[PDB]
Structures are given as structure tokens and as C-alpha cells.
């Protein structure tokens, strides 16, 4: 009375019905379908397999064949009433990876059963914890094409497989758009488990893994004896009781590993077991990757790794540099450099190749990094430090240099900078260009310099590309040539006290004029008929005597050097007398004293003015200065001028080969008003006259030539009586009255001002 038909291939409908009440075993049934062609069969059980009919309602009449009567019942079955129950799947092979703890499943879909395309939905179920548990459930959709296709499925586990047994189950559920009936899920496949043989060679899993800092990792420990706890360094961890005596722990956001690694141990009754975990970081991008060369033969490239990888020893990050155009690669050895030169690698150049496209690749057991850069080997050359710098002389006004430069620079040129460092001057620099050669010494000579001067030479050179400057070479000190005379010294002659000997004085030539060390002086007092008294006096003697019988001899003082002689300085020895001489006074304005004289047209050669100290009985330290005839007013600059010291100035005239004295002037470097008034005292006083006497003021406090005294007197209507007589030290006043108090005031005055005054009160006698 209840007919439920099922189908597993969309072609043959397996309809099953219930047996009527009262029908015993061995009952014959005559069941068929009312269709276009009535073809009924005979079967023995209550399960008939009929083909797939068309869309519509069909009449099914059952006939229970018995020996006591027959039963006839009708049923109406449609496509919407038949349930779709596909066959259960079957696992073909089940494999599991032991190193990575990854499962593998293989199963056949049996596509040849269905002729039309249909969407198949697979549901894989992963089990473990043999008592009971459920972990994973992932959906898988496939497509049927009338052909049996073998599918593959993989999944990685988090817990080591050596600590638990797993189970695998999978079912299917097809989707047929042409089937208007009910679609049911297929039954679950027989359980296919994977089992591991407990050989128990170690205890803790895993062993020396390399994981990133911040990930999840689950440890386990298989043991047959009771355990106590688990420790990660100094921190504890909660235990998870697995099957048997096995325990597990969970670690979330693991910290950075140490040098020896974060040893995770499992303490027991009498022993202890544990392994080491290594937590690291991905490799950082190589920063500051700049390759250059030093001699156009090798390419030395350095880079900064930046953030550390936290992995050393047999798991350190290895660097690999490979060429792009040539494919040549190089690998760094285990021996690494200290932090100052953390990473550097040499690369051999390839001939007739200038463009380089380097690609450095780093790799660790955690990841990999790379970096690309295009470098021109001809623009990134480092000029090597020049060596063997030597200095060689050529002549008086030139010197030659030489230095060596290793490398094959025969195709490029050099721009070498020569620094000229003269003692007590400004630093001088010179630039010179030279064509580069292959492993040879370059020689460059310089000129236009002052002779007799110590110099310090150091050179640094760079290429024409102007990429980097070479280091400064070692400084070399060398001396120039002997000397080079330019002009003659200033000379002056004087006569002795006996009127027979003629002493000669001359000043040493300066460095800018002599341009060298003076060796000797060639003095000669010769007449117009014969050269006589040719003597040579050496340094530092700047005076010499030569006996002369007549006054028409000319003096030619010539300084002697190592190369030649100085230009001769001629000076006359005849002294024309001059009886019209007058003493004059001069006032020094500041440091120098001005000299004023009228222009004389008869002067021939120049003017000479001499001066010395007139406040000493010792012989003077006479100094002179030649002034041309076109000048009429000059000043004398000397450090020997001191306040309060009188200097006698003598002006000589060059008239007809003879020095004739013109003016004799005396004065001081400074002249002003006196600082103190002359002290005066009363000696005698009458009823109608008084007497006063002042002391002579010394020249140290007078500060000039005293012109006189200004004596003031009046009742205390005052009278002023000037006394211009410098020798008159006595003063008397007549026409005086008695018993009157007078105020006597004495004040000195000079050309540079009027000094102070002294006063006193006295009463005249009766």
C-alpha cells in the first residue's frame, strides 16, 4: 500500500513496495506500468527495477499471486515522487605526509554512471581523538562529464600525527537540473583511518623547526610514564591530556628566540625531555646597495641588511649576487665581516662590458628577498691614493713633481690638483690635467714661484668623470734654489772724527727684495781713473771702513749671492760745506715726525735724512732714508722714537756729486702742554717789593720747548706780565703797597698748549 521508488543513475528506477497483510513467504508478484506498450513481468520479491520513463503520471498495478486468491491495487508514480539517492562513495587510497603532517585523499566519482552533466558537492570530514571528536568539514564541488575522474584533496594539520590517530569520512550530493524529483544526500563512505607505529625514538615534537615570530605552534610529548608539567624557559604552560599519557601545549604569539633557542621541556618523575624551537623573521631588503670599483678590474659592492634576521649558525641568511647579461653568480662563504663592514662582495669585471645590471638575492629558511640596480662601471671608479710622491728641482724658478698611480687608465684622463703651501702665507692650489696611462709614473713641473722659500707639496687627483676624490698623499717638504738678486741695498756714508777714515753703513736687503740669503757685500771706493779698495765683507757685518786720500771717490756697495751679484748702489763721498746752518724745531704728529723743506733745483740724485739719539754719550744708532728729488715733504717711521727723547735730524743735498747739509732740525715724537707748573717760592719781601724764584722745569715733563712764564698777581684787578726770557729765573715787582694780601699765580705756556698753574697767599711786610 506504500510505494517508494529510488534511483541512483537517472536511468533505472528501483521501486520498492510493502507486502500486503497476510502474504507469506514465496509470494509471486506481477507488477508493471501502464504505458504505451503493456509489457508486464513476473518477480519474486517486493523490489522492481524499471527504466526511466517520460514526464507524466503512470499507473502501476500490483498482482499478488496466491493459491487462495489474488490482490489488485493501483499506484500513481511521478518523477516528482521518486527520490534521488546516489550510491555511496568509496575511498581508494589514503596517504599521509609524516614530515609536514599533511593528509592526502583519493576517490573516484564514477562519472560514467550519469550521461548528462551534473554539479557534484563533496563533503570531507576529518576526525581524530579515537574516543570522539570532530575537527574539519570542508565542501568540495566538482563537475561530472560522463567519465570517471580521480580527484585529489590535501589538508595540513596543526598537531603532530605521532600523538593521535585520525579518521576520514566523505559523502557526495549531486545536483541535476533536469531532475524534478527529490534529491537526497549519499551515505557516508566506510571509515578509513591512518595509524602510526609508535616506535618512540624521541619524546617531543617537532624538533628544531623554523617558524616566524607571531605565529601559532602546538607541541606534544609522547611518553609511557607520568609527566608533571611543561616549561617554556621560565614560564609555565597548561597541559592538555590527550589519549594515554600524551600531553600537548599551545603557544600564541611566541616571543623572539634566543641564541640557544627557547627550549621547551617536559619535566617527569626522574628525567626530563625537551627540544629547541627557532623563531625568526623574514629577510630584509638589502639597503644602500651601491657598487663601485677601484682599478677597473674588480667590482666591490657593499650593502646594509637593516633589520636582523634573528637566525645565526647553520641557518644564517645567505646572499647571492648574479649577473644579468652574463648569468655569472657568486656566493658568500660562512666567514662574515664585523658590523663596520657588515657585507661586501667582490665581482670580476667582464672585458668589453661597461653597463652592469646587478641583482642581489638573499634567502633564509623563512623567505627570500631581492634588489635590482643599474650601475655604470665607468662612472663609479674610485681613484686610488697616489704613492711614491717625489720632488725634483729643475732650475731657479721651477720645480718638478712625480707620483705613481696603479691601474689601466689609458683611455681616461686625470685632473690632479697640486696644493702649494708656502710658510707664513695663504694656501695656494693649482690644477693640472694629464692623459692617463697604464701603470706608469706621471711627472708635472710647475714654475712662476719665488726662490729661497721652503714649500710643502701634497697632491690629490680625480678622474674627468668627477665621481670621487682620492685621498691626500703624504706631504713632502722641499727647499727651492739658492737665491736671485733683484735690487741693491740702501747705503750711506759718514766721516770719522779724524777726517781721514770714511765709515760706510748699509741696511740688509729684505726677503722680498734679496730673494735669498746674502753671502757677502762687495764694497769699493773708486775714483774716475782707477778702482781701488775692493774688499768683501760677510754677514752680519753691515759696516766697513776704507781709507781714502781724496773726496772724489764713489762708493759701490754690491751684495753677493750664490748665483750672481746685486745691482750696485752708487753714493757720493764728497761733503760740500755749508756755513749757513740754522737749528729748527719740529713737532711729531702721532708716531712719525713731519719734515718740511723748500725744493732746491740744484739737487741731482736724491735727498738723505739721518737721525740718532742726542740724549746719550754713546755713539748713535744712526738710521737714514733716501728720498727722491721730486718729493718735498716726507715722514719718518721708526720704532726707536720714544716720548721725551730728542732726535737730531740732518737734511743733506745732492749737489754736484756731493752731499751738502741743508737743515738741522731737532724735536720729539710728541709735544703738548706741560703737565705740572714750575714750583716757586718767596725769598725776600719788603714794604713795597717782593721777590720770587721758580725752578727750571725738566724736559721730561715740559713735553716741548718752553717759551716763557706767565706770572699773575693781584689783590685777593689782576695784572698779566709775560716773561719771554727762558734764562731769567728771577722776578721782582715794584710800586707795591703794604698790608695787602695778593694772589700770586704762575703758569707755564708752550707751543702745544698752556700748562697748569700754582698759587699761594703771602702778606707783604710793613
Amino acid at each position: 500500500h506504500d510505494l517508494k521508488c529510488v534511483t541512483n543513475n537517472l536511468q533505472v528506477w528501483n521501486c520498492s513496495w510493502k507486502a500486503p497483510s497476510g502474504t507469506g513467504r514465496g509470494t509471486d508478484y506481477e507488477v508493471c506500468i501502464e504505458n504505451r506498450s503493456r509489457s508486464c513481468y513476473q518477480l519474486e520479491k517486493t523490489s522492481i527495477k524499471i527504466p526511466a520513463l517520460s514526464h507524466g503520471d503512470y499507473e502501476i498495478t500490483i498482482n499478488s499471486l496466491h493459491d487462495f486468491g489474488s490482490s489488485t491495487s493501483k499506484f500513481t508514480l511521478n518523477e516528482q515522487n521518486v527520490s534521488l539517492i546516489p550510491d555511496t562513495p568509496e575511498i581508494l587510497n589514503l596517504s599521509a605526509d609524516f614530515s609536514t603532517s599533511t593528509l592526502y585523499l583519493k576517490w573516484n566519482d564514477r562519472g560514467s554512471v550519469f550521461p548528462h552533466r551534473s554539479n557534484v558537492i563533496w563533503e570531507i570530514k576529518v576526525l581524530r581523538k579515537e574516543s570522539m571528536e570532530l575537527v574539519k568539514l570542508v565542501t568540495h564541488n566538482t563537475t561530472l562529464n560522463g567519465k570517471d575522474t580521480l580527484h585529489h584533496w590535501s589538508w595540513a594539520s596543526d598537531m603532530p600525527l605521532e600523538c593521535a590517530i585520525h579518521f576520514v569520512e566523505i559523502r557526495c550530493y549531486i545536483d541535476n537540473l533536469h531532475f524534478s524529483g527529490l534529491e537526497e544526500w549519499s551515505d557516508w563512505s566506510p571509515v578509513k583511518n591512518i595509524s602510526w607505529i609508535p616506535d618512540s625514538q624521541t619524546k617531543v615534537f617537532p624538533q628544531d623547526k623554523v617558524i616566524l615570530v607571531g605565529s601559532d605552534i602546538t607541541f606534544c610529548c609522547v611518553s609511557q610514564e607520568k609527566v608533571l608539567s611543561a616549561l617554556i624557559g621560565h614560564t609555565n604552560c597548561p597541559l592538555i591530556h590527550l589519549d594515554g599519557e600524551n600531553v600537548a601545549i599551545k603557544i600564541r604569539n611566541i616571543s623572539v628566540s634566543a641564541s640557544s633557542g627557547t627550549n621547551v621541556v617536559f619535566t617527569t618523575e626522574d628525567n626530563i625531555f625537551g627540544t629547541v624551537i627557532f623563531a625568526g623573521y623574514p629577510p630584509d631588503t638589502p639597503q644602500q646597495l651601491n657598487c663601485e670599483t677601484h682599478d677597473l678590474k674588480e667590482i666591490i659592492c657593499s650593502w646594509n641588511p637593516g633589520r636582523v634576521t634573528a637566525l645565526v649558525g647553520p641557518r644564517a641568511t645567505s646572499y647571492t649576487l648574479v649577473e644579468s647579461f652574463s648569468g655569472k653568480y657568486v656566493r658568500l662563504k660562512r666567514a662574515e665581516a664585523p658590523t663596520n663592514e657588515s657585507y661586501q662582495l667582490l665581482f670580476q669585471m667582464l672585458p668589453n662590458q661597461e653597463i652592469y645590471n646587478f641583482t642581489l638575492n638573499a634567502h633564509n629558511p623563512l623567505g627570500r628577498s631581492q634588489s635590482t640596480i643599474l650601475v655604470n662601471i665607468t662612472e663609479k671608479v674610485y681613484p686610488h691614493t697616489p704613492t711614491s710622491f717625489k720632488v725634483k728641482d729643475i732650475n731657479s724658478t721651477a720645480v718638478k713633481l712625480s707620483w705613481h698611480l696603479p691601474g689601466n687608465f689609458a683611455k681616461i684622463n686625470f685632473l690632479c690638483e697640486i696644493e702649494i703651501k708656502k710658510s707664513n702665507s695663504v694656501q695656494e692650489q693649482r690644477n693640472v690635467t694629464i692623459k692617463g696611462v697604464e701603470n706608469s709614473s706621471y711627472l708635472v713641473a710647475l714654475d712662476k714661484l719665488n726662490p729661497y722659500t721652503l714649500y710643502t707639496f701634497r697632491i690629490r687627483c680625480s678622474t674627468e668623470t668627477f665621481w670621487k676624490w682620492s685621498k691626500w698623499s703624504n706631504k713632502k717638504q722641499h727647499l727651492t734654489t739658492e737665491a736671485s738678486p733683484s735690487k741693491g741695498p740702501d747705503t750711506w756714508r759718514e766721516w770719522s772724527s779724524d777726517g781721514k777714515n770714511l765709515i760706510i753703513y748699509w741696511k740688509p736687503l729684505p726677503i722680498n727684495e734679496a730673494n735669498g740669503k746674502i753671502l757677502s757685500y762687495n764694497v769699493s771706493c773708486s775714483s774716475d781713473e782707477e778702482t781701488q779698495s775692493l774688499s768683501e765683507i760677510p754677514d752680519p757685518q753691515h759696516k766697513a771702513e776704507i781709507r781714502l786720500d781724496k773726496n772724489d771717490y764713489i762708493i759701490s756697495v754690491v751684495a753677493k749671492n750664490s748665483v750672481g751679484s746685486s745691482p750696485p748702489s752708487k753714493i757720493a763721498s764728497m761733503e760740500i760745506p755749508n756755513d749757513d746752518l740754522k737749528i729748527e724745531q719740529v713737532v711729531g704728529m702721532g708716531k712719525g715726525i713731519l719734515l718740511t723743506w723748500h725744493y732746491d733745483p740744484n739737487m741731482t740724485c736724491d735727498y738723505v735724512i739721518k737721525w740718532c739719539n742726542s740724549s746719550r754719550s754713546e755713539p748713535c744708532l744712526m738710521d737714514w732714508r733716501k728720498v727722491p728729488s721730486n718729493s718735498t715733504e716726507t715722514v719718518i717711521e721708526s720704532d726707536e722714537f720714544r716720548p721725551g727723547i730728542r732726535y737730531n735730524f740732518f737734511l743733506y743735498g745732492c749737489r754736484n756729486q756731493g752731499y751738502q747739509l741743508l737743515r738741522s732740525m731737532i724735536g720729539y715724537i710728541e709735544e703738548l702742554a706741560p703737565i705740572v707748573a714750575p714750583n716757586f717760592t718767596v725769598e725776600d719781601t719788603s714794604a713795597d717789593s717782593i721777590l720770587v724764584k721758580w725752578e727750571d722745569i725738566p724736559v721730561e715733563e715740559l713735553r716741548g720747548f718752553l717759551r716763557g712764564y706767565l706770572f699773575y698777581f693781584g689783590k685777593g684787578d689782576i695784572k698779566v706780565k709775560n716773561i719771554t726770557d727762558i734764562s731769567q729765573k728771577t722776578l721782582r715787582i715794584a710800586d707795591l703797597q703794604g698790608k695787602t694780601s695778593y694772589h700770586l699765580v704762575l703758569r707755564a705756556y708752550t707751543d702745544g698748549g698752556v700748562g697748569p698753574e700754582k698759587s699761594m697767599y703771602v702778606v707783604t711786610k710793613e
Binding site: 624538533q207 634566543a258 641564541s259 640557544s260 627550549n263 621541556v265 626530563i272 625537551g274 629547541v276 645565526v312
Partner: protein, 172 residues
């Protein structure tokens, strides 16, 4: 050039030997730095760093041995400990990594000072002998325990040889 015996005074030679042994018997100088630098600075793990039987000769054997055999055994033991110490130095990390992790380089300094101490002890033993004229693969955590056991056995042997040296005062 080089003399046969580095010293000719038996008294000062024996004094040098005794002082060297008393200096090298420093547990806090040798063993504790190793356990501190190996990350095993916990009492539970320190309780297991003990000497295993059959690693170093016994005090009874050292007392029963004579003089030349004693010197030869000490020479062979010093050679073996030098080889194992070279292996351990190959195993230990670098000073920069120690400073980065937070450890101290004093342990490495003490080891690199104790190795020349072993060399000098061997040289002094040679001087005395001339003067008298008569496991495929191991675990990273297992290697540390092996180092503990080896160093403890070495310290026990050093204590034994120190007691031996202190036993006999003088000898003709």
C-alpha cells in the same frame, strides 16, 4: 734556543703546579658560566647537570697510580679535554649574538682564559717529567646535558688531582 726543562727548582715547580691546580679547580669560574650561557639557569635543570660514571678516572686510581703513569694519564686527559673544549668553542655562539640576546661575554672570556691554563698545565707537566729524569646524531637539548656531565666530571677530576698534589709534599 729553547731549554729542555722550563725550570730547574723542584720546589718552585711543585708550588707552581699546586697553585695552578687550585686555580683551575674553580667551579664557579668554569662550570657555572657554561650553564648560565646555555640558558639552563634554573634549579630544576641544574639538578641534572651531574657527572656520569665512567667518564673520568677515580680518586682511588689516582692515589694508587705512581708518578710517571700519573703524569702520562694527566697528559692524555688534558689532551682529551682540550679536544672537547675546542669542540665546545666551535659550538658556542658569537659575542655579538650573546650581547644581543642579553647574555654576558664573561663566560666566553673565562673559557678562552681556561684553555691556555690547560696548555700551561700541560707544559708544566712536561717540565716536571723532564726534570725528574727517572652517536650518529644527537639532540640540541641533549648536547647541553652532555656538556654539563663532561664539565662536572672534569671538575671532579680537577678536585682529585688537587687532593693528590696536596698529598705528597716533597720528593727527592
Amino acid at each position: 734556543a729553547a731549554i729542555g726543562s722550563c725550570s730547574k727548582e723542584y720546589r718552585v715547580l711543585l708550588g707552581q703546579l699546586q697553585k695552578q691546580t687550585d686555580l683551575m679547580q674553580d667551579t664557579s669560574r668554569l662550570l657555572d658560566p657554561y650553564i648560565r650561557i646555555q640558558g639552563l639557569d634554573v634549579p630544576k635543570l641544574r639538578e641534572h647537570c651531574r657527572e656520569r660514571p665512567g667518564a673520568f678516572p677515580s680518586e682511588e686510581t689516582l692515589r694508587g697510580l705512581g708518578r710517571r703513569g700519573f703524569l702520562q694519564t694527566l697528559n692524555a686527559t688534558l689532551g682529551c679535554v682540550l679536544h672537547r673544549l675546542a669542540d665546545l668553542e666551535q659550538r658556542l655562539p658569537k659575542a655579538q649574538d650573546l650581547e644581543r640576546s642579553g647574555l654576558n661575554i664573561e663566560d666566553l672570556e673565562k673559557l678562552q682564559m681556561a684553555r691556555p691554563n690547560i696548555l700551561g698545565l700541560r707544559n708544566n707537566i712536561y717540565c716536571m717529567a723532564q726534570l725528574l729524569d727517572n652517536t650518529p646524531a644527537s639532540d640540541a637539548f641533549q648536547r647541553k646535558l652532555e656538556g654539563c656531565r663532561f664539565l662536572h666530571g672534569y671538575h671532579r677530576f680537577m678536585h682529585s688531582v688537587g687532593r693528590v698534589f696536596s698529598k705528597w709534599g716533597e720528593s727527592p
